[PDB]
């Protein structure tokens, strides 16, 4: 994220890190055995066996005492995801349970985020400006406003690219936004998950708010594919 400050260690218990092969993504714990991420993260369909999920992390790829690591037993991409429009950009990760039948072991550092009931914080370990060389090390969060679809859609902003299922957030003046390395990241409002970090055009540029998957738009899909 761009324009933000280091997040408190306990501020984002729900956020999850996803590692496999040479790739990385973020997500949100929405139930003890379920992470919600972006479909474009798993576009290339890696094998569940190769995925590692880490909960309770503060420093990207850094082992820590509250950290909890989990295998991924399966995942479901939304059937209508388009790798062209990036519409319907969400996916569910079913975590692998241990012998007690538990996945995440909840604690002050590991807890699910509420799905929306139906001003915001964005969080992630990605680039602190566009073109940045490395990932943040400490988790960043920044506060960003919601943007009405009629104003995000306007032709000076994002235009025809804003489709059903997307939502926007940030200052039209620019400055605070997510970036590369923040995909699947949580947009948290009033605390509930209302967006998934999906795409934009250049981190925080003027007149270019970030584009997120609108989680409330997909409640029914999430309920349906989140039993079990």
């Amino acid at each position: 994220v761009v324009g933000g400050l280091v997040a408190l260690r306990g501020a984002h218990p729900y956020i999850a890190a996803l590692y496999w092969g040479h790739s990385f993504c973020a997500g949100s714990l929405i139930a003890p055995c379920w992470v919600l991420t972006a479909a474009h993260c798993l576009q290339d369909r890696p094998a569940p066996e190769d995925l590692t999920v880490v909960l309770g992390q503060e420093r990207r790829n850094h082992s820590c005492e509250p950290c909890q690591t989990l295998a991924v037993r399966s995942y479901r991409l939304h059937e209508a995801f388009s790798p062209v429009s990036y519409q319907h950009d969400l996916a569910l990760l079913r975590l692998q349970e241990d012998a007690d039948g538990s996945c995440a072991l909840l604690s002050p550092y590991v807890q699910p985020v509420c799905l929306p009931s139906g001003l915001c914080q964005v969080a992630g370990w990605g680039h602190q400006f566009e073109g940045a060389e490395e990932y943040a090390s400490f988790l960043q969060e920044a506060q960003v406003p919601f943007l009405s679809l009629e104003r995000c859609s306007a032709p000076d902003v994002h235009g025809s690219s804003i489709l059903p299922g997307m939502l926007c957030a940030g200052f039209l003046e620019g400055g605070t936004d997510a970036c590369q390395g923040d995909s699947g990241g949580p947009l948290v409002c009033e605390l509930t998950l209302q967006g998934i970090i999906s795409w934009g055009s250049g981190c925080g540029d003027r007149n270019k708010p970030g584009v997120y998957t609108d989680v409330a738009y997909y409640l029914a899909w999430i309920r349906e594919h989140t039993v079990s």
Binding site: H40, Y86, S161, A178, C179, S198, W199, G200, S201, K208
Partner: peptide, 18 residues
């Protein structure tokens, strides 16, 4: 403009700005 997908392997999101 140009639009990319917030992933550090990042792809172009296609018919944006062109």
């Amino acid at each position: 403009x140009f639009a990319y997908d917030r992933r550090x392997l990042s792809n172009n999101x296609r018919n944006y700005x062109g």
